[PDB]
Amino acid sequence: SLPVVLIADKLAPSTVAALGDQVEVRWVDGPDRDKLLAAVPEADALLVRSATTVDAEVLAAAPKLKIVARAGVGLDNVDVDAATARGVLVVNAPTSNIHSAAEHALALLLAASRQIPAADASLREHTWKRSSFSGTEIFGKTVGVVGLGRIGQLVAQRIAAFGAYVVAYDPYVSPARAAQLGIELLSLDDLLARADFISVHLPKTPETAGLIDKEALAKTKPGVIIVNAARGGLVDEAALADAITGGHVRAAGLDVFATEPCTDSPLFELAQVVVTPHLGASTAEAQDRAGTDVAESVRLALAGEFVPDAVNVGGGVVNEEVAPWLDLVRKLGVLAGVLSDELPVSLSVQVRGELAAEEVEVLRLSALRGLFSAVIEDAVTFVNAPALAAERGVTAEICKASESPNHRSVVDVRAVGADGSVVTVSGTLYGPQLSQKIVQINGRHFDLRAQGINLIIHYVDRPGALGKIGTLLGTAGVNIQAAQLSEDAEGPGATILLRLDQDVPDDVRTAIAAAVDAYKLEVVDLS
Amino acid sequence: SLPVVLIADKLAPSTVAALGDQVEVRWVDGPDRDKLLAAVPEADALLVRSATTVDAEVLAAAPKLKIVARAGVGLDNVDVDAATARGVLVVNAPTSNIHSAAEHALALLLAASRQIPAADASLREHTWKRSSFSGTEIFGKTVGVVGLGRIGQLVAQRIAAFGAYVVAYDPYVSPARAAQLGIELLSLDDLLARADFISVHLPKTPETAGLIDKEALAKTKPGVIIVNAARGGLVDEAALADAITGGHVRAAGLDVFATEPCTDSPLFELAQVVVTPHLGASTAEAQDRAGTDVAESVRLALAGEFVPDAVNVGGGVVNEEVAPWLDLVRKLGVLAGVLSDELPVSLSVQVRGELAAEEVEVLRLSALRGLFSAVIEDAVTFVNAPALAAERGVTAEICKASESPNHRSVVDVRAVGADGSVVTVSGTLYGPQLSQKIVQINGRHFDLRAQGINLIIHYVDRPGALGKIGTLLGTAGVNIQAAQLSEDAEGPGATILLRLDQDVPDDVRTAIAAAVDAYKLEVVDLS
Amino acid sequence: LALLLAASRQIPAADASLREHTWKRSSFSGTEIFGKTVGVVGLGRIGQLVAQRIAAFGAYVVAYDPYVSPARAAQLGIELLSLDDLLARADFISVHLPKTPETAGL
Amino acid sequence: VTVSGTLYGPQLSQKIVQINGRHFDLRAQGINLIIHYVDRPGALGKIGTLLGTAGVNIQAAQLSEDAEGPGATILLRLDQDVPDDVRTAIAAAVDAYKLEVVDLS
């Protein structure tokens, strides 16, 4: 009895030939709800593009669904939580648009530097205004790449062949990886100061949103050309218009908008700003690749094989014993990354005690997901480790030990720095509810909920420090839910971790740092 | 017509079952020269242990030989040069003895700490001298591992479960790799000062020979127990005896001797020194593994597949266009390693110009072989990259570019540091003789033979520096064959590289460093 | 552990042959521990410590001690067995004071 | 006498790359001292010492050994000219077959 693969959006049979001859492939008009709901009961797999919405209704109606595959990068049209909730593997095609997007960033940079649209318009109005235009030459210039994921990397490679010097800002690429690319890693401030061109290649996360605001725009070089074909809003639209109009930034190119569909932007009134309706992946080659990618993911998944491009966890993929640990270990990765001075070159995950008897490779992926959350979009839960290692230069391993010193099971995440220094964070689960607990940081033991807004301070001025901190926080109106503090075993230092009911305003953070003479002050949300 | 695999030493059919049913396996008495020479003409592969000598005579007599496989680690009984000379792949079983050797190091450490042989002897002489003995407890002690290759790593893992703290000396393991192992990397001087136990796990290279001499022995902790089951002579035998007799080192264990067979060592007159006749790999399990390893290498090799455990280059393995580049690129790796402040985390090999059209992956291996020469034994030419990466923490990649700026072909080796700093060295070949030339170091261009003893100096005091250096060298009687020197483009520094006809005595090196205020002074042999 | 290794690699005999200035290398053949199954008879504290040191050699550990905490045993990496099953499966055996002294047998 | 040059890189920098079968890569600019002499221990030392003693700074230098012979050949780019008497002393100090100074601006 051949497995049924239901295609609910416009993917050609040829596009999806990677599926074997071992499946029955059917098509449905996905956007038509009645049709979809009638066709899906029999489906073992469902492929979709962007037009079909794979909500809970669809899922409830598909009792033998094993995979939802989105032929694209976004997951807006799929409820991944509901799919995980029902043991359905969700997959996308995460690298299918990279060349088309890189090429479009370059397209936009050149189109802005040489005013292609306006010039084309003048000739289109049957006049010859050659004398009016003045372009900007790329050769010899410095180009700032803000975000060095896959696409930012391709843009740097292409722009470098124009004879431009490439610098980048990305706290999430190792220095050795950047050096292998022949790219100079910079603070954002230094990139701003130095760059004649800026191309943004960040994901949208609240760490990222409106990164380049007016404050940032004012630090750039006069004459900068700035391109964003990444995510709407990374560059503050109104601040750009201001800077464009004022003359300070010569030109810009945008493919994405704070909200789209966008038809009313003031930027649309500015000639020196080239704009395209989110076309970065609007390419036959990218749409075909999205399809052949996802056709292979669906093959592997039906072959009981391992699915690299998986986005979540669904099925036998993970035991009931292990499953609750995924989220805890993700939080340990977040924590180890925050407590680290810079990006670790690797994570060692040690699994000890009873849990060590389980199959726990997924825990290695959780740690990495946590470490990299600032550059990962929420829907995704799994990330491709080999790709992460090759793209960003960071690896993870798992080690097991039969014995856990205190709790019946503990997981330790060791974040190791290029200089051989190590940051260690541990958690357990226990109890009828399996509450997640952080139980160690760097040789100090305690028992704190792995949840909420946590403030962590390493500091040097000790006496009355508890009072100073709690008094500043409480004057700011901030509740302190739980706390852990200890004076360092060796040295003048001390450390404290507090769970708060809200974030800490910057001025008050500055006040606290000043009050106890902090060398490290961080606020991390563990929810 | 089934391929013939000739076994010339004592390997059982079962040991070699990894060979398919697609081969004819025959046996011969290898040590019997007449038999061997009569049997080998028909052989496609030859497996050997240690008793058969595979010299040029054997090779000349075996016209269709494709592989010589040594079931073991050593290659003393095989002329690898002659085999390469005739296009014969040589293979060993490089990891077959690691567990037996680690276990034997531990065996020797315990046997020495608790005086097992002497005690066993007293009971063997039918007396009870319990009151006479006094052992040393490992728990809580610091153990110094000198050399952190595979075996030193296993010893550290086993000794750590005894509750010992582990430190190591190895300039050829990254700090991040050591930190992943939970091992503290130390200067040799600091290891000496700190260690209650010392286990040596170096290869024999002239970088290594007699490493632990009297000077070193005198820096150790009073009461040290020292074990060498690595290579004869790493610990100076007479200096040990002195230190043992004098009482400063309490006990030692040795499995290997400056020259063996060894029957007359003074150490044999010392009870507090446990000795074994090179037994580290004398185990059925290790001999069986050596065989099953090598049986698989021979399978892969006959299957036209890739042979990880290859020791040299033989056959189609490498084009005639590429072949001469192997040795040059090895020398670039040596050079990039010497010019580096510490071990690079990776090597980027850039191949540019005409050579870029060739298949050049082997060049990546050459670079690594060069970088690691101080811990690689001469016979080996190829090393296993994946194993090197996992064991020591260093990787290599190849990049091609159509264009070479000046020479028709150039290879650049970029040694990248964990901090993102980069050392670059380039060479070409050209001419009827294809002479090997070093043509660039860190953005400075020149044309110097890649051969002989080269002295390299980075220094800060510039005027008359050429005179100072050449005068010191020539007063020492040292001829200067060739030279390259330039004042840094930016900064107070300058650099010079000289080819000399001999090494530079330490005092004179000290004098030169002092004379020009050097910050880096190195002497490397590129022959 | 010292004795187990000395018996495995015939250390005392090997050392003696050198002391009488002979090179008897070809006379010796040891037993590798890695991957082997080690039986611990009795799990008083010293036995437990032995199990742990042994496991680091990559050996599987089984033990006989019907009064030890099963949970402690599993934390030590130990598979608990009847003595019959231990004798059947063991490549190495180390005998130890049991958890319940001294009704240990022979 | 044979002299060879090439141009390469983004600036197209002019390089002297050969004199009489010996290879170099030196900018075709400034004052350059060329010496062909008898390699003895001490020889490069004496050249350097005399130049330094005279206050003549060396910007770059490259020496190569002859393919077959007692000789060696060096090119030094200098920050100023070398007085006659100093050229003579240099020549004597090393039994030079040839010693010349050329402005390559």
Coordinates of C-alpha atoms in Angstrom, one line a residue, chain A residues 175-183 345-346 348 350 395 397 399 414 416-422, chain B residues 175-183 345-346 348 350 395 397 399 414 416-422:
Chain A
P175 CA 37.1 35.0 14.5
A176 CA 38.8 31.9 12.8
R177 CA 35.9 31.4 10.5
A178 CA 35.9 35.1 9.5
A179 CA 39.7 34.9 8.9
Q180 CA 39.2 31.8 6.7
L181 CA 36.8 33.9 4.6
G182 CA 39.4 36.6 4.5
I183 CA 36.9 39.0 6.3
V345 CA 34.3 27.6 19.5
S346 CA 32.4 24.6 20.9
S348 CA 30.5 20.1 25.2
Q350 CA 27.8 16.2 29.4
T395 CA 30.6 22.6 16.9
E397 CA 29.7 17.1 21.2
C399 CA 29.7 12.9 26.4
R414 CA 30.5 23.4 28.7
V416 CA 34.7 26.3 25.4
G417 CA 36.5 29.4 24.3
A418 CA 39.2 29.4 21.6
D419 CA 41.7 30.2 24.4
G420 CA 40.7 27.1 26.3
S421 CA 38.7 28.8 28.9
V422 CA 35.4 27.1 29.9
Chain B
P175 CA 43.9 24.8 23.7
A176 CA 40.2 24.3 22.8
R177 CA 40.8 20.6 22.1
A178 CA 42.6 20.2 25.5
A179 CA 39.8 22.1 27.2
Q180 CA 37.3 19.7 25.6
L181 CA 39.2 16.9 27.2
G182 CA 39.1 18.7 30.5
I183 CA 43.0 18.8 30.5
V345 CA 43.4 26.2 14.4
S346 CA 43.4 25.7 10.7
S348 CA 43.8 27.4 4.3
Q350 CA 44.9 28.5 -1.8
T395 CA 41.7 21.3 10.2
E397 CA 40.8 23.3 3.5
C399 CA 40.4 26.9 -2.2
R414 CA 47.3 30.5 5.3
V416 CA 44.8 30.9 10.9
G417 CA 45.0 31.5 14.6
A418 CA 42.2 31.0 17.0
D419 CA 42.2 34.8 17.4
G420 CA 41.7 35.3 13.7
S421 CA 45.3 36.3 12.9
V422 CA 46.8 34.9 9.8

